[PDB]
Structures are given as C-alpha cells and as structure tokens.
Amino acid sequence: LSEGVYRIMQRGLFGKTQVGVGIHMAGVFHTMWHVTRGSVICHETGRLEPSWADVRNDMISYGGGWRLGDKWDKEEDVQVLAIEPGKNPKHVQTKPGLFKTLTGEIGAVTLDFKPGTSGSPIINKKGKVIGLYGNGVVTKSGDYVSAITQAERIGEPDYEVDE
Amino acid sequence: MGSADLSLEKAANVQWDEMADITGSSPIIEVKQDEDGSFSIRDIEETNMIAQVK
C-alpha cells in the first residue's frame, strides 16, 4: 500500500522464500514476469491482482498499468538497489553497457547479485526507478549481465522530435 | 473463496546512495541474435590498454 521496494515471498514447507523483488510506486506494484508468473500477491491490506504483462520483456504490473516512465539515458551511471534474500538492501553503482538487439538498445548492467534479486530497482541520480534488475544473460561460467528492464520506449529511436 | 500464492515484505525505499561502490562497471556491448530457433548472444568488452614493453 505504501510506496517503496518490496520483497516477493512465497510460503512453502519451510516458510517463506524470497523469489523476487518488486517496487510499488504511484499506487502500482511493478515486478518481473518470471518472478510471480501472474500469481496474485497478498499483504495485510489485501491481495494484489495483475493488470498488465510483457512476457517477451519479462515484466508484469499489479493494480494498474506500468507507471515507471523514466528510462535510462545513455552514458549515465546507474545504481541497483539489490534486495538479496536474507541480506540487507545493498546499493551498487555501475556504468551500463548496451544490449545490441533488433528493436533497440537496452542498458547492460554487469552486476551479478544473488538469485532472487530479480526485480531489484535500477535508480538514476534523480532518485527515480529507470529499470528492473533480473532479466539478463550469463557467459560461459562468467559474469552475469542484466538488462535495464523498462516498459515504454522498448523499440523507439529515443532521438526523434515526435512523442 | 480460497487461495494463497505469494506474500509481500517491504525492504527499502527508492533512494540514491551516493556512497555506493562503482566496482565492476563494465560497459560491455552485447550482440544478441537468433537464426534457427536458438539464440546466439556474444558479449564484446572493450578494455583499455596502455602500451608496455618487456
């Protein structure tokens, strides 16, 4: 109900385990698709129902559309508010790379946090979320890289005069 | 009704920590492509190199 970063826990035989991370901002809970896979999330106040998802980009919103509009500007340092399971929140800053793919260029974060951090917010200097950590790629026994997962501007040139 | 899947636990708020470490800040360029149902992803790092003799 309150704006902030939330751990997404799943009750099991041995209690609740953090399967991912989500951000509630402007009244909508934003997280990754592969984390919750559409399952409703309940809290003291009540149960959250999904509203929008993008399985190709691994994103899902609860209680409304994607309100995180701030995207990453190229050649700007970002911070990942990694919520590792059990451990306290940890802030790490990095200079993102690029994901050269058809349909656009996505920021490439080289930080390799522990599993379960999928959905950790990626924050710009202005203190606003510009992406989500979790969906990325691993090398042959090498350093995991996560894409700055953001909803809008997934295929736009980001240099035109129209909007 | 009756169901139960996943709960929430707040951990932090969106704030920029200026004292965060900047280690591991590789601006790698990753070319992802697919040809025949598989996906081929190469990562090109561009590390800086100063000349040195032996």
Author numbering:
A (entry chain B): 18 to 180
B (entry chain A): 46 to 99
From the paper:
Non-structural (NS) protein 3 is a multifunctional protein that has N-terminal protease and C-terminal helicase domains. The NS2B-NS3 viral protease is responsible for polyprotein cleavages between NS2A/2B, NS2B/3, NS3/4A, and NS4B/5.
Construct eNS2B47NS3Pro had seven residues from the NS2B/3 cleavage site inserted between the NS2B cofactor and NS3 protease. To provide the structural basis of the self-cleaved eNS2B47NS3Pro, the crystal structure of eNS2B47NS3Pro was determined at 3.35 Å resolution. Using molecular weight analysis of intact proteins using LC-MS, we identified the presence of a second cleavage site at 3 amino acid upstream (K128/T129) of the conventional NS2B/NS3 cleavage site (R131 NS2B/S1 NS3) in eNS2B47NS3Pro. In our structure, the NS2B cofactor adopts a new conformation, where the NS2B C-terminus is not fully folded back as β-hairpin. Instead, the NS2B C-terminus occupied the active site of neighbour NS3 protease in an adjacent unit cell due to the presence of the C-terminal NS2B/NS3 cleavage peptide sequence. In the current structure, the cleaved C-terminus of NS2B (126QVK128) enter the neighbouring protease unit via a side tunnel and occupy the active site of the NS3Pro of the dimer unit. As a suboptimal substrate, glutamic acid and valine side chains of P2 and P3 from eNS2B47NS3Pro are rotated away from the active site. We also identified a small hydrophobic pocket that is exposed only when the NS2B is in the partial closed conformation. Hence, the structure reported here is suitable for co-crystallization/docking with allosteric inhibitors.
